[PDB]
Design a protein around this ligand. Sequence first.
Ligand code: A1BTK
Ligand code: ZN
Length: 140
Amino acid sequence: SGAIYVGNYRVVNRHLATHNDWANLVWEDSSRDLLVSSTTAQGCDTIARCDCQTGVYYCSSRRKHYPVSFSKPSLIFVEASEYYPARYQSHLMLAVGHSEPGDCGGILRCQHGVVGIVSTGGNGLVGFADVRDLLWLDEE
Ligand SMILES: Cc1ccc2c(cnn2C)c1Nc1ccn([C@H]2CCNC2=O)n1
Ligand SMILES: [Zn+2]
């Protein structure tokens, strides 16, 4: 679990969005595993606006943050697992690292701010849904 709180927006994995998120929806995209809902209180997170490929992510299944190198956002075939079927996911970045389903929502950050959230994994990889291209998160 986990979310990004930027301005009056809450960014979560689409497959973990609550009824309140869907009832206060701003934007959603099934191909990216992302959903953004509106919030009453303003949040403190800053979104990175950059092309970094190194950063740090939070892994809840280890209670640890790890430094990683990650690929630029791409359309990737995500393999099937014990818990979720195979599917194509766009705007996804991959790194070598540990992740389990409950790690979804952990933040990946670079020197410029939040880059994305954990969205895929297994087989020794962790995948993050990018948010750096959603420039509208910074306005209104
Ligand atoms: C982050 C990560 C890591 C390992 C992962 C997955 C999925 N199967 N494995 C081995 C994963 N992502 C997803 C995407 C959809 N989910 C469902 C599955 C049960 N709870 C969820 O949130 N998990
Ligand atoms: Zn950066």
